[PDB]
Amino acid sequence: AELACFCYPHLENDSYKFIPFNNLAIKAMLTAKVDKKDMDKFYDSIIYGIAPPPQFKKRYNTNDNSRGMNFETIMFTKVAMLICEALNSLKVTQANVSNVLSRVVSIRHLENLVIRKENPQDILFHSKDLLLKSTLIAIGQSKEIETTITAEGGEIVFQNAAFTMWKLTYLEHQLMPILDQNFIEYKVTLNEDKPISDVHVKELVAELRWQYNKFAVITHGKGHYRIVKYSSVANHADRVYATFKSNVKTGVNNDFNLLDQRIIWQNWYAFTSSMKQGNTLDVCKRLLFQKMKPPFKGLSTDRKMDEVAQ
Amino acid sequence: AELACFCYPHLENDSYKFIPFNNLAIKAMLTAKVDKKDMDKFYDSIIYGIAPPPQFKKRYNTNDNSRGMNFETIMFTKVAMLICEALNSLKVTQANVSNVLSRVVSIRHLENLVIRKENPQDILFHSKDLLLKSTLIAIGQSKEIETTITAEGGEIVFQNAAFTMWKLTYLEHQLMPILDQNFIEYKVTLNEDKPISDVHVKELVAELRWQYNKFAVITHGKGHYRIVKYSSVANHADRVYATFKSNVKTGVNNDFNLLDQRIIWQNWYAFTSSMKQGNTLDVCKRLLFQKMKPPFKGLSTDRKMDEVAQ
Amino acid sequence: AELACFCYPHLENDSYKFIPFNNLAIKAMLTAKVDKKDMDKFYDSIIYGIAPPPQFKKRYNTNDNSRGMNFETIMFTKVAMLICEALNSLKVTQANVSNVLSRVVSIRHLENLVIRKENPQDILFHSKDLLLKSTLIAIGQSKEIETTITAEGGEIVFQNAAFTMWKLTYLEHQLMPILDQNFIEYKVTLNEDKPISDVHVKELVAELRWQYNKFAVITHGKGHYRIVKYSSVANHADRVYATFKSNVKTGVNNDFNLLDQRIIWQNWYAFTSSMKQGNTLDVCKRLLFQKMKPPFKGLSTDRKMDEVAQ
Amino acid sequence: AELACFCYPHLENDSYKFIPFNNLAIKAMLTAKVDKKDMDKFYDSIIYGIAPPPQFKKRYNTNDNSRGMNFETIMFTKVAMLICEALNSLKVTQANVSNVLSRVVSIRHLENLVIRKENPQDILFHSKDLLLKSTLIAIGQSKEIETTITAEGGEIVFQNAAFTMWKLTYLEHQLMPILDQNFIEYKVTLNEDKPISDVHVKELVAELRWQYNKFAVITHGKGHYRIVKYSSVANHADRVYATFKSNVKTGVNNDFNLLDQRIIWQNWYAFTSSMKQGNTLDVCKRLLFQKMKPPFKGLSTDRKMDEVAQ
Amino acid sequence: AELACFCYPHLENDSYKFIPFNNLAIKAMLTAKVDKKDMDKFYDSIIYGIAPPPQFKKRYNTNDNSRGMNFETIMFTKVAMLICEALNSLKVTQANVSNVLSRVVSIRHLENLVIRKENPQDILFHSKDLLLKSTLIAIGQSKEIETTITAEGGEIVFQNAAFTMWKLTYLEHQLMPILDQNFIEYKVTLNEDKPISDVHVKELVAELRWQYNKFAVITHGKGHYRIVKYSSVANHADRVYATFKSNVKTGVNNDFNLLDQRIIWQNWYAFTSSMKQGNTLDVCKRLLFQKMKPPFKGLSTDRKMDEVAQ
Amino acid sequence: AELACFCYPHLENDSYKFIPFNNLAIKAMLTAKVDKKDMDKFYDSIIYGIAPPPQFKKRYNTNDNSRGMNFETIMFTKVAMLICEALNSLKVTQANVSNVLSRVVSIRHLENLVIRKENPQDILFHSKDLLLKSTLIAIGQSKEIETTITAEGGEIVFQNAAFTMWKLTYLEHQLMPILDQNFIEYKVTLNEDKPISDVHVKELVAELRWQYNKFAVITHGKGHYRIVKYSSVANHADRVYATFKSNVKTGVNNDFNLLDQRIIWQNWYAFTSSMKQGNTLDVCKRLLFQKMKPPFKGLSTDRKMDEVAQ
Ligand SMILES: [Cl-]
Ligand SMILES: [Cl-]
Ligand SMILES: [Cl-]
Ligand SMILES: [Cl-]
Ligand SMILES: [Cl-]
Ligand SMILES: [Cl-]
């Protein structure tokens, strides 16, 4: 959802500060009759403060909407506050406020950061600089790519010198849980944005081939791998291409890290390279479904024999 | 109940301060043998402090009374304290104490204000001036009429530029819950005590005609609308007329805002206008039951067609 | 779903008898690798008997399907048996079996008949002839239209000399419950398939205008009224037109009872009359959304005044 | 455990009938002081009838034994009765009784047959001949091998024209549940003891390679496949070799079906062929751990591409 | 309690049949005003039939009595019926009825027989002759002594060729449970009323010395051992002597089996022998408390060494 | 487990401070691919800090290990902190760190000290010096032997002027509970490390002979008695001899207090004296199983007679 679904701007001393919404103010907005010229303007619920613009009613779950977020949840306030602490660390100026609040962000990403920041074991609990760095990446206001230390988080299921693999815990989320209970997705972040030796690559590929043979190794171009069911990789291609097509239309630059060709699923590397080369959706998406028959041979066999022993 | 059911006066430096009762002191009073000359005097339970006058035993629920209040409830203390903070904001003088404590107030109104004041989202939590303004209206010690910001509260179910509609939550109340579970009443407050444009009136009427077609739009004259089942509007007429008749007998002024004729139910506007003109109960109450066949035509049809679309 | 989702044919003495499936046989089928030439043929699970054709896997809820039926439910067997008792009352011959089993039926309709037949208060519990009549209507193997005595059932919420109004209990169903919890639909059956006096029509219309003002009074042409939210009447038009278009294409006769023009919602009567006259979907569906401004005036006022009294 | 852990022989008319034990008689035996010469003889608990020989106390779970069976369970009686119905279908003669009761059988196998026989959907519920055939195989008193119809049972997770794959439900068993909760084993039975076409073999291998890539496909020689974790295949080799070594020592014939070489895990086919050829445990077990690098190429790729589509 | 607390006599054809009381008839009796001359006569509750004589109110637990029995329990009816089946197996004649109903019996003994008779594993469930034999012993209407097969029952904790040791389950009883929760008593019955070899005696003594070193081995003279805490053996002596003194006063014969001197606790054998010789309570009870320092040496050591091994 | 399973060293100002692990850092380590040369080195989980060396994965319970500790428990952190407070009270220097962290300690001992230190009634709650003294004994970094005041703790079941007897509460432990539920062990500490009069010895022996006749009185040489089931004393001998053999091999001194010969079980005193004299395991362990037939005669009889009285 848009950043304007969690906070409204308030100017103080020629520098903007952002204020979380009260969920009851959102609840009052959802019952409001509003002019068409006011659907983009912030809403005054007399009792509970400012509420998001009524054009955003879709974003909130009501008895009629199940495709929004659970704003009456404590996690909503926590996520909204996390957004505000990041936006207040910037000094957004008047010309930028509407664009920053127009930014679409992953709510599940922001909830997982809250889960990290409130965990005393997690480094994000102890480093406001790292927490702010991670959030600014999450809200698209940072040049840096997500690595392990700044990762969205979840359950660590594999780690080596170069990579950390996370199980995405979206089924347990308070604010915007994924509703299909058949959902499983993993995420492999780089521990350091640096060249990675071949043995650490083999360690990752061997674990993905053995433990996750039913999953595609793909990427959305932002610097980390996504471990995704093969039955859903076609939908990922649609969303990835919609994003790449949007930035060409919107003029904003499309920087797409294809990542390691020896790790990425071959068909996905073909579909993304062809997309980067400027092909149409139909052209490069047909490369997902065509079997290109053609590294690290015997990696699966080595792991299996290590299981037969021990 | 009377304000004396929650607090007793204590003089300090020629200015009165009011003290909430302990519920155990009330419990001791209910078991007390008292002279007739002492039924109006405050009762000394040796152990738990001062208790209300024994003439008020009716007001408290016992195994023999279910038509009083649940004084052994934490909400009793909270409501009593709310009354005291308001009475202490005045400086009631000796001549006035008995009349102020004689004031009959709506307990459900005072409980809903407690619910607002303890909610951090509600403006009453943050403005002691607004909370005191709202309470002084509730206890009949203010000239101003209840508007949205100072409203008794409840669930917001409709809002526009001019009005806020509340669902009265009396079935969930701790202190004096309504016992018929078939009860539903709403309340429409003015956001601002100001002339209201015709479009904002149409928005309200269209919502009441469509969403609340089984409810009468009436008023008790104190500046806001009451959305009331038609099956109970006859009882409202009795209470409204008893009040109007009392003030004529008691000499206190009867100021009765009939409110907008285009919003009020036609029969109720007739019964209240006729009452204001000085007619007997039988005369003006017969106007409730007689069908006067004779605004905003097609408002119900427009809303219905907006539902057929979308 | 198709009748073949509940039973398979077994020939005995040149007359067909139908046998319910075991749900474990269905469970075995859902895990079966099957040739393409065998997707229409009944499946032999060695252990649990015959299973439906693998082309019907969509009809059964699995972890991957939530848009099918809960076949592992006792209600599945009960519904399947109800289908078999009806099909065995016919003597389906070889040429007819595949067409009878191809018939698409409302599962929720069949579950409600089970609910009636197992209720000792219901006449369907006591008359196997009436139960068989009701089921044969439900599975499209009867000339007669559904009336009150043969109705699908549910909760009676209104009744007079001519009509019975049922609340459809689909949210509580075991086999194929409706998942949107915001669902409410009613159904008005004729007590007798006979001309109906004007006073009994007024009684129905007055109750629908007063108690169900937010609902459209429509029909799918099979002889009874459906009380449906205005927000969903557009979807009903799509399904009704798809059915009418199918029978023109499939050559099967389209007999569409428009029912009483004084009861049916005006726009729906226009959309269905125009459909019957042979117009395209776009032509007659635009009549749903256009406000035609133009019986029984003051019916709503009479009911409201009866509430103000008593 | 031995068959004598569930029943004792009782002679009637020169033909033996077997009687289940009462669990309280077993409980009395476990507290009994017994001579050494009587440890093999059946025990008379005065109150609860005959009890198994005290040499079998190991087989029963007590507070000191957790490696036996839960005899105080209703499933014990059910399994014991199942054994007796099978033994009574034979007419065991005096010379044979002690050997038949000496037979060691899989308790989990017998419990799963009880689960099948008490399920009205299962064919074993309806065919006493099939139930007796299945039990006689289970207790080693039949020439025939276990196929699908006579299978031990469990959850069907794959089926085609030639094979049925069962999930072994040992963690949920009442009588002798497997205690490691990390246990998962499957079992592939032949639907018919017959030559099997190559396409039905490919269907099985493709499902095992894709859905069970972390499992070894082995066999214990009795005519069906066992789908077993690679980490436990070494323990299976020990038990398989102990059995093969026992029959050579005990003189009883060792008939070991190696099954299809294109389905069995290559190393297991080598270890079992070498065992059949008469090699020592060390010789043929080293073939499990040595990687022999050398059917049905691209089967895994075809299944994966079918997932990318649909 | 007396047998008259469970049944009343009804004459049929010059032979008495006994009828259980209804507990509501007992409840009516407990609230009855009765003449003194009628305190021994059976009570007519008009509604619930005959009730026990009002002189027995002590025997029934009321809010004022906790030292009686829980007659409103299903076990009361079961015990009463068990008494009646035994009394009806006799043909009590007119002269005997009052004496038979005057017999005092152990209610806990009778409840344990009910527990045996309703257990399908127990031989008492299957032999009405054995059940009647056991009950007639329990109600003092049989010459035979309690042995294992006719035992009161409980939990078997030791058994050998000659003895069965029972844990008395009185804390779990429905009708008259022992209320001190610190109660533990065992009972050793003879399997056969026959001379017993020395090895079977050693087996018992070794188990009592090792497993029950804090318990006295005593007897009440009726042919079986009672395993009793040393802290309570003084109370057993009081009750045993009261019984022996009663029969000398009442003239009824005192037959007291001292049982095996090598098993009985030495002091108890002295106290009972001295009582049998006709000494006063003070004389023979002082032998309980005096330490007589003087079989089967090293029995405790052998058992302990068998534990160090294995 | 080793002390390195709870903390890692961090140098500050030429003196080492020890830091507890986060359990999530341990959880990340358990999923880590690590070189062989790094299995002894502390592991960096990027997110949760330092983790123990991967050679210690055995020590932590996972779904595959049930023979380790429950590190995700709050008690793990509490025990780790207790270790750190003790290690920080020393000033471990660089040469000593690896040896101190190599020390193997009883986790159950450390958990019981946590239970003492967090109990406001316990002196360890109030004396940081006594708590540190007790912990340093527990982690083998103190010359002093465990006495009552510094005891591991548990339930006091006997106490006199010289001894305190504790019931070891290992079945209720959070971190490393004993899993056999048949476990019972006691521990007798000296109240003061001083010669003990004969009457206080008799008091202890009389209580152990009477109340714990099924338990062996042994010791592991560290200055206190262990009350242990006879069935497990053979396993204690194995562990005691393994320890004594280790220190002779490892060169570290073997100081073994045999304790009072009148209290220790005779066979254990023989096995430990013979071990101290330098005999092989087989030689001195055979003295456990051989019955040496040969203090304080009549102690058991005196206690029993005190029970017969009172
Ligand atoms: Cl990405
Ligand atoms: Cl008002
Ligand atoms: Cl219809
Ligand atoms: Cl096999
Ligand atoms: Cl006795
Ligand atoms: Cl020790």
Torsion over CA of B126, B129, B135 and B140, rounded to 10 degrees?
A: -160
* Residues of A marked as catalytic: 224
Q: How far apart are CA C37 and CA C14, in angstroms?
A: 27
Among candidates A149, A156, A160 on the partner chain, residue whose Cβ is nearest the Cβ of F27: A156
Q: Residue C37 is encoded by which pair of tokens?
A: 């030439």
Q: How many CB atoms lie within 10 A of CB F309?
A: 10
Provide the 8-state DSSP code for F248. H
Q: How far apart are CA A269 and CA C169, in angstroms?
A: 51
Q: How many CB atoms lie within 10 A of CB B271?
A: 27
Which residues 40-79 of D are in CB contact (within 8 Å) with E?
A: 45-49
- When computed from its CA atoms, the radius of gyration of chain E, rounded to whole angstroms, is 21
Q: Residue D19 is encoded by which pair of tokens?
A: 């009687």
Q: What are phi and psi of B193, to 5 degrees?
A: -75, 85
Burial class (CB in 10 A: 0-12, 13-18, 19+), F242: exposed
Tokens 């809200």 belong to which residue?
A139
Backbone dihedral region for residue B78 (phi beyond 0: left; psi -120 to 50: alpha; all else: beta): alpha
Q: How far apart are CA C218 and CA C269, in angstroms?
A: 8
Residue B200 is among the residues annotated as catalytic for this protein: no
CA neighbor of A9 nearest in space, from A45, A50, A39: A50
CA neighbor of C123 nearest in space, from C149, C156, C159: C149
F12 CB within 8 Å of a chain D CB: no
Q: How far apart are CA F228 and CA F232, in angstroms?
A: 7
Q: Which of B10, B173, B200, B224 is catalytic?
A: B224
Mutate to test the interface with D, among F62, F65, F66 (most CBs of D within 10 A): F66
Experimental resolution (Å): 2.6
Mutate to test the interface with C, among A62, A65, A66 (most CBs of C within 10 A): A66
C32 CB within 8 Å of a chain B CB: no
Distances (CA, A) of F216 to E214, E304, F147, F229, F303: 17, 9, 20, 6, 19
Q: How far apart are CA B5 and CA B21, in angstroms?
A: 8
Contacts of range B6-13, beta carbons closer than 8 Å, 24 or more positions apart = B6/B52, B6/B76, B6/B79, B6/B80, B6/B83, B6/B84, B7/B80, B7/B83, B7/B84, B7/B87, B7/B101, B8/B42, B8/B50, B8/B52, B9/B92, B9/B97, B9/B101, B11/B94
Burial class (CB in 10 A: 0-12, 13-18, 19+), C218: buried
Largest CA distance in chain E: 72
Q: What share of chain F is helix, strand, coil (3-state, %, to 5)?
A: 45, 15, 40
Could you give the residue ranges of the DSSP H alpha helices within chain A?
23-30, 74-89, 97-102, 107-117, 128-138, 198-211, 233-250, 266-276, 281-289, 299-308
A–B: how many Cβ contacts below 8 A?
46
CA neighbor of C27 nearest in space, from D125, D154, A182: D154
Tokens 């299945």 belong to which residue?
D134
User: How far is the centre of ligand 6, averaged over its atoms, from the C-alpha of F259 (Å)?
Assistant: 9
The residue of chain B nearest to residue C305, with distances taken between CA atoms, is B289
F181 CB neighbours in chain D (<8 A) are 63
Q: How far apart are CA E289 and CA F304, in angstroms?
A: 10
Q: Do D307 and A213 touch (CB under 8 A)?
A: no
Q: Residue D95 is encoded by which pair of tokens?
A: 């010379």
Q: Do D49 and E121 touch (CB under 8 A)?
A: yes
CA neighbor of F45 nearest in space, from F70, F20, F59, F27: F27
Contact B151, B189 (CB under 8 A): yes
Backbone dihedral region for residue A57 (phi beyond 0: left; psi -120 to 50: alpha; all else: beta): alpha
B194 known ligand binder: no
The residue of chain A nearest to residue B116, with distances taken between CA atoms, is A47
Distances (CA, A) of D124 to D80, D128, D150, F110: 17, 7, 8, 57
Contact C103, C142 (CB under 8 A): no
Residues lying with their CB under 5 A of ligand 6, a single-atom ion: F 219-220, 222
Provide the 8-state DSSP code for E65. B
Distances (CA, A) of A173 to A115, A177, E92: 10, 5, 79
Q: How far apart are CA F5 and CA A191, in angstroms?
A: 25
Q: How many CB atoms lie within 10 A of CB C100?
A: 21
Q: What are phi and psi of C110, to 5 degrees?
A: -70, -35
Q: How far apart are CA D84 and CA D17, in angstroms?
A: 8
CA neighbor of C11 nearest in space, from C65, C64, C88: C88
Q: Do B121 and A49 touch (CB under 8 A)?
A: yes
Label residues D60-96 b or e (16+ Cβ within 10 Å = b): bbeeeeeebbbbebebbbbbbbbbbbbbbebebeeee
Torsion over CA of C35, C37, C42 and C48, rounded to 10 degrees?
A: -10
At B259, is the secondary structure helix, strand, or coil?
coil
Tokens 């066949």 belong to which residue?
B293
Domains and CATH numbers, chain F: 1-144 (3.90.1400.10), 151-308 (3.30.428.20)
B103 known ligand binder: no
The sheet that has B155-159: what strands, in order across it? B155-159, B163-167, B185-190, B225-229, B215-218
Residue type, E283: V
Q: Which residues, listed in sequence order, are joined to residue D150 by a DSSP beta bridge?
A: none
Q: How far apart are CA A160 and CA B283, in angstroms?
A: 90
Q: How far apart are CA F295 and CA F298, in angstroms?
A: 9
D22 CB neighbours in chain E (<8 A) are 121
Residue type, F126: H
CA neighbor of C84 nearest in space, from C41, C54, C50: C50
Q: How far apart are CA F63 and CA F80, in angstroms?
A: 23
Q: How far apart are CA F39 and CA F54, in angstroms?
A: 5
CA neighbor of F228 nearest in space, from F287, F262, F268, F196: F268
Compute the half-sphere exposure of residue E240: CA atoms within 13 Å on the CB side of its CA: 29
For the residues of A6-57, what is the DSSP string, one character each? TEEEEEETTEEEEEEPPHHHHHHHHTB---GGGTTSPEEETTTEEE--GGGG
CA neighbor of E190 nearest in space, from E220, E161, E231, E227: E161
State the nearest Cα–Cα gap between C247 and chain B, in angstroms: 26
Q: What are phi and psi of F272, to 5 degrees?
A: -80, -40
Q: How many CB atoms lie within 10 A of CB D203?
A: 22
Tokens 């035994």 belong to which residue?
E86
- The three-state DSSP-derived secondary structure of F184-214 is CEEEEEECCCCCCCHHHHHHHHHHHHHHCCC
Label residues D176-201 b or e (16+ Cβ within 10 Å = b): bbbeeeeebbbbbbbbeeeebeeeeb
User: How far is the centre of ligand 6, averaged over its atoms, from the C-alpha of F285 (Å)?
Assistant: 18
Provide the 8-state DSSP code for B277. T
Contact F110, F83 (CB under 8 A): yes
Which ligand neighbours the alpha carbon of C218 most closely?
3
Chains E and B touch (3+ CB pairs under 8 A): no
Could you tell me which chains touch chain E, where touching means 3 or more CB pairs under 8 A?
D, F
Q: How far apart are CA D276 and CA B204, in angstroms?
A: 90
User: How far is the centre of ligand 2, averaged over its atoms, from the C-alpha of E283 (Å)?
Assistant: 97
Contact E190, E148 (CB under 8 A): yes
* Residues of D marked as catalytic: 224
CA neighbor of B149 nearest in space, from B136, B161, B131: B131
Q: Do F46 and A119 touch (CB under 8 A)?
A: no
Provide the 8-state DSSP code for C145. P
B121 CB neighbours in chain A (<8 A) are 22-25, 47-49
F129 CB within 8 Å of a chain D CB: no
Could you give the residue ranges of the DSSP H alpha helices within chain E?
23-30, 74-89, 97-102, 107-117, 123-126, 128-138, 198-211, 233-250, 266-276, 281-289, 299-308
Q: How far apart are CA C188 and CA C160, in angstroms?
A: 11
Which ligand neighbours the alpha carbon of C256 most closely?
3
Mutate to test the interface with D, among E121, E160, E208, E307 (most CBs of D within 10 A): E121
CA neighbor of A300 nearest in space, from D213, D205, D185: D213
CA neighbor of D165 nearest in space, from D176, D153, D157: D157
User: How far is the centre of ligand 4, averaged over its atoms, from the C-alpha of D222 (Å)?
Assistant: 4
